[PDB]
Amino acid sequence: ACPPDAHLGCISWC
Amino acid sequence: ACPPDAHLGCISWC
Amino acid sequence: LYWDDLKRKLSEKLDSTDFTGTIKLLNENSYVPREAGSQKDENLALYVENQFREFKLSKVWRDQHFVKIQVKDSAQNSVIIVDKNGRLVYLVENPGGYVAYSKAATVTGKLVHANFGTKKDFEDLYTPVNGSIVIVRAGKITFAEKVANAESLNAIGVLIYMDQTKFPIVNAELSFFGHAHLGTGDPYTPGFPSFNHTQFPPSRSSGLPNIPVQTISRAAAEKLFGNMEGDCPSDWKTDSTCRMVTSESKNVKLTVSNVLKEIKILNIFGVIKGFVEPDHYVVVGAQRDAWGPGAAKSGVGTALLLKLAQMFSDMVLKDGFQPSRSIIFASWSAGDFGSVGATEWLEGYLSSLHLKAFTYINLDKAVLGTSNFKVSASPLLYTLIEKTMQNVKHPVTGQFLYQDSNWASKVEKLTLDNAAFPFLAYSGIPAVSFCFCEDTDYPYLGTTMDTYKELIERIPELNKVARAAAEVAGQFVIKLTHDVELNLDYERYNSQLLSFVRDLNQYRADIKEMGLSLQWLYSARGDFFRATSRLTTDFGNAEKTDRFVMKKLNDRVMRVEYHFLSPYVSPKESPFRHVFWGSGSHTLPALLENLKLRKQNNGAFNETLFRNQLALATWTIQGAANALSGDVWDID
Amino acid sequence: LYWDDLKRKLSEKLDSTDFTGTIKLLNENSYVPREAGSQKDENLALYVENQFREFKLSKVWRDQHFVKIQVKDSAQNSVIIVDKNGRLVYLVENPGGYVAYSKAATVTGKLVHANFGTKKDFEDLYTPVNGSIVIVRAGKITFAEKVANAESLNAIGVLIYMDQTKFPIVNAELSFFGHAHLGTGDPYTPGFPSFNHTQFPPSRSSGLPNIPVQTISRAAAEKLFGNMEGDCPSDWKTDSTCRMVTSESKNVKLTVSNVLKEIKILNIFGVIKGFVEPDHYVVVGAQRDAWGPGAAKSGVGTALLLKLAQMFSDMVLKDGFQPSRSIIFASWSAGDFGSVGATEWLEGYLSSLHLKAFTYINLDKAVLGTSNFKVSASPLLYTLIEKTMQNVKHPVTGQFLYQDSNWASKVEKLTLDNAAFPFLAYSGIPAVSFCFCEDTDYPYLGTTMDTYKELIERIPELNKVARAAAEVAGQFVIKLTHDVELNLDYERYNSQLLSFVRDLNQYRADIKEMGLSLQWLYSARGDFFRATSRLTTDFGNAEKTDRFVMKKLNDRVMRVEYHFLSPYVSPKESPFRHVFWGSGSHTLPALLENLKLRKQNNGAFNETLFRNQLALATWTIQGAANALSGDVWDID
Ligand SMILES: *[C@@H]1O[C@H](CO)[C@@H](O[C@@H]2O[C@H](CO)[C@@H](O)[C@H](O)[C@H]2NC(C)=O)[C@H](O)[C@H]1NC(C)=O
Ligand SMILES: *[C@@H]1O[C@H](CO)[C@@H](O[C@@H]2O[C@H](CO)[C@@H](O)[C@H](O)[C@H]2NC(C)=O)[C@H](O)[C@H]1NC(C)=O
Ligand SMILES: *[C@@H]1O[C@H](CO)[C@@H](O[C@@H]2O[C@H](CO)[C@@H](O)[C@H](O)[C@H]2NC(C)=O)[C@H](O)[C@H]1NC(C)=O
Ligand SMILES: *[C@@H]1O[C@H](CO)[C@@H](O[C@@H]2O[C@H](CO)[C@@H](O)[C@H](O)[C@H]2NC(C)=O)[C@H](O)[C@H]1NC(C)=O
Ligand SMILES: *CC(=O)N1CN(C(=O)C*)CN(C(=O)C*)C1
Ligand SMILES: *CC(=O)N1CN(C(=O)C*)CN(C(=O)C*)C1
Ligand SMILES: [Ca+2]
Ligand SMILES: [Ca+2]
What we know:
The complex is a heterotetramer, with 2 copies of chain A (14 residues) and 2 copies of chain C (636 residues).
Chain A: no helix or strand
Chain C: H1 3-16, H2 19-26, H3 39-54, E1 59-72, E2 78-83, E3 88-93, E4 99-100, E5 105-109, E6 111-113, H4 119-123, E7 133-137, H5 143-152, E8 157-161, E9 178-179, E10 213-215, H6 218-225, E11 228-229, E12 245-246, E13 250-256, E14 258-272, E15 277-287, H7 295-317, E16 325-332, H8 340-348, H9 350-353, E17 357-362, E18 372-377, H10 382-391, H11 420-425, E19 431-437, H12 452-458, H13 462-481, H14 493-505, H15 508-513, H16 519-541, H17 547-557, H18 560-563, H19 588-600, H20 607-628
Parallel strand pairs in C: 4-9, 6-7, 7-8, 8-10, 15-16, 15-17, 17-19
Antiparallel strand pairs in C: 1-14, 2-3, 2-13, 5-13, 11-12, 14-16, 18-19
Helix pairs in contact in C: 1-13, 2-7, 7-13, 10-13, 14-16, 16-20, 19-20
The complex binds a molecule of 2 linked components (NAG-NAG) (4 copies), 1-(3,5-diethanoyl-1,3,5-triazinan-1-yl)ethanone (A1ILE) (2 copies) and calcium ion (2 copies).
A molecule of 2 linked components (NAG-NAG) binds next to α20 of chain C.
């Protein structure tokens, strides 16, 4: 599982 | 005066 | 200290360094995922920079670039099946992943399978692709090439999937990422650096596709195959569920949406300055960024970068290691988008790098398996590589890596997705990339399952294997920096030249019909050969002690790679100028490509082009021999 | 030996060497005339080569090129006046001379005077030239530029004459020669060498005109003026007989015929090898070929080449002169057709020359008069030049050449017809050309009256004057080869950068309107400045004795000129890549040219171009500063 905050590791729209 | 053999010094048509 | 001393000290450091622990640490939540320019990429950048400081390297520094990346946005990325009227029949998938630098567009058409999407895959299809959408399996070539090939046959969009056979993944729903820039670097600063000083002028790379591209799950692909007819050639060796063409009533509509974002990226550097010629250096490099957790993609390489810089710093600080030449360690961002961070550094500091950076070692994907040790590199590095394989041992078997006598003749050239490629093809820095590898591709690359868990489960011996990757690269560093010879084998280019002349000799009739001759190419290959003999003789007679005569000889070695960069093309419009390893109509392969088309006789052959190609390839080779030979007045 | 020792020994050799005798000898019948590639050119080539051998130079050698030259053929070259129906009115002239690389064609139209044919001459005309023939006076710019300017305003042909005022020639019937290639080198091998190995592929230079061009006598011009109306602006300062436009009933028809010949040309070389760094060298060069006898055009320069090589060989063989670096002496052919022999050498051996040839000294037309000493060069050479003028004496007055403090700010840049131009603009070798000169052009250049008789009659002091030209160049050679510093002043580029920024600052409103900024250019100029200070500091602290640290510093000096060669353009399509001294849209002048057109607001300004120009000029400068500054990791 990616962490719940995965979006902070994404420049693409999460 | 150029020499009488001037043509030998010419690649252009003399 | 001597080679033997340095080999043992390295062996020691290696024996005690903890590789899996470093990789495990890079898979922690703060670093995952770490798409280039994201908070988590930045976090890992700061970690790496801070580690470099702790290691007390001569100098630690960073570069900042603003680059343009087309990324998935909030809108629908979808593939749906549509009756011949446009009416929905079935949504297939809203894919999780995306393909960067895809065209944003919505397109509808037949679906035609093209295997891997190689030129020959396209050649051999019975179904025409003009005006239809293509589906291709991942593998063999880059996404960018798949798309370019398709677009050149007037395809209207592309789907990419992972077949079960080539990619045995339990989960059939798995998403995946990549890019379709046919190139490296920021597509919006082709041939110049993404620095504020440029003020970002309007400028677009020829490598950007003009059709949409999207990744889909295997599940999605199977649903589409269930709407398609025609058995796939069994020599494709895909799954049974494979099919070739949409049924007569059925179309598919691809919608992709993305936005062009300016992203700040960080390259993080350290150097260990040399003791004698500190202004000359090797570069060791690893991608830090990734879509998903990127344990194999970026973490392994980043771990190796870290441990290498640490060990070498210990060796210098503690065991009296004195490299004559310097060592730069580079942690690159935006590798996942096409070696972007590395390329911008090269473009930014070319004037500083020229004949100073004399080799590049890439660390990415150095550990994917344990079966094979595969390498790709400049011929200049083959001998060093050979020596290294003969004295480094496999981590599983206890045997030396050098099993195959003929290994050098099987080496594949660097490709567009490898970060060593621009080092060699654009800046003419000899470069090497290597891995412990299976015959299979590591299937989790570009997916959310590229984790430490998966890596160690698949490679229980990870730590020993990583230790062996590190030893390969460390030996390269030492042989490259410690001695008074470089370990760059210029003689290796003689067989590359033979191969080329041999291939060209096949077309002697075509040459004869054109009133042309091979004498001068033959003669230039002989000049190159003789120039290498003389240089090797000069090495043999040199007072090794005499640092001036050794510098003169070595500087000639340091111009060899450079002189194969075509001096006739615009480095902005054709950056891969290396006539052997680059891309475009100035390369030696391109010259053969063209000439082959003459037998075909289709008016595909361009004779004016071929005459100019032959001229410039001839003189580039002759000019390289002439320069290697010594001073102008000494040429015969 | 010290500078003082070497200066005196040179002075001695000079005092005894016989200049006029050498020039007289080169005007003998075997050498006259000596159009490039002619029997007589070849004869003089063999003489020169044999002399070099007699001088016992380290090595004597020759290069052979086959180049394409368009020359006058057997058919009619004529200008006739024609009534408005085509009926002959008057043959004006069958001219003796011709313009090489003219279009072969016959054209009829009005005749319109355009003074010298500068862009501004064309701007300021009231008569439109679209569709008519132009007449222009020789001078100010090259024939090639005259023609290009005319062709760009859709003129249909060109006539060139020598007005009495600017050219006081008793004989009004005198013919004259030149070329109209807007370029250097063989027009049919643009950007690559004219060597058999290329097999001469189809390839044509952008610099070839597409309209006909012809030289005519003053007599001929006067006859035409007697068919024309309109007084010429008195600020033209031409003769009274001048007029501007053909009368209403009168046309003129120009017919020119020529043939494209493959010609073998010879470059003849000697070298005096250096004692310490023989692989680095200065080059000294002189045109050997000419249409007509070419005493001033080629003989003076060739005489200087010979005597210089002789004296230097004596100095080494006899007086213990030990130059650290080598000296090449080059006798070029096909200079009269646009520095062709020199250009092909540069293109042929670029890989061998790169950062090895560190200066070029041209000798052509070094003696035209006695009034003024004029020089054109790389800024890198200004200080050496200054020092040389302060210690060399005028041959007529006994006073030092350095009269003017501000001389450096009045220097005009090298132009297309000077053979130093390609050395600097294409290969990035600092170069210098110089002369004793009048305010007038020497009127016999390109005519059959360029003889020894005319030269000595006009310059009775010829021998002393030639002796002084030789001393200038000899001092350059010694200062450049003898010391452990180079005498290349990198700091000179700071004022060139100031000038550029100052000019650009005039257009700050335009920059602001475009949302652009000058901060980075300003900042890059400061970086360059600081990098020059540090380097000069490093020189000041160096152990001069220590040959390694002196080589490191000097090698940085030897990259300065090179780093101003634009790395963004194709050297084949834009060979004059030097951003200061070259030609094309990548230069710094070009950037201002474009930006000036914005105020004009005519849609002449190209904003996308200007944005790309600013970016690349900025980074070229920044990149030069960065590289001069030291190692990559040391940049701020
Ligand atoms: C260099 O360029 C970048 C991108 O153009 C600049 O960063 C942006 O600045 C604008 C204006 O202040 C902000 O609105 C953006 O959020 C920034 N973009 C990012 C971080 O992607 C940066 O300021 C420039 N640096 C200079 C001029 O020193
Ligand atoms: C065959 O190749 C030649 C050489 O590359 C192409 O010619 C160039 O065409 C462009 C515009 O199309 C011109 O601006 C160049 O000057 C041309 N170069 C030369 C040397 O001719 C040509 O277009 C190609 N033709 C075919 C058959 O595709
Ligand atoms: C190099 O090229 C030149 C010119 O193409 C060759 O000289 C010509 O050779 C032809 C064929 O023998 C003759 O008819 C011409 O008279 C020669 N041209 C000249 C001197 O202008 C020359 O032979 C070639 N050299 C080689 C192949 O070694
Ligand atoms: C203004 O200048 C631009 C940039 O040089 C010119 O654009 C190029 O045009 C060619 C064909 O005309 C294209 O193949 C290039 O890709 C263009 N480059 C760029 C960066 O746009 C443009 O043609 C010029 N336009 C005007 C007003 O003349
Ligand atoms: C958890 C994970 O790795 N992924 C991949 N993504 C990125 O790398 C940006 C996308 N993603 C999101 O949570 C947005 C899931
Ligand atoms: C005598 C002389 O110098 N000229 C100039 N020409 C050349 O230089 C070729 C032409 N010419 C001829 O005799 C053909 C007269
Ligand atoms: Ca870029
Ligand atoms: Ca050429």
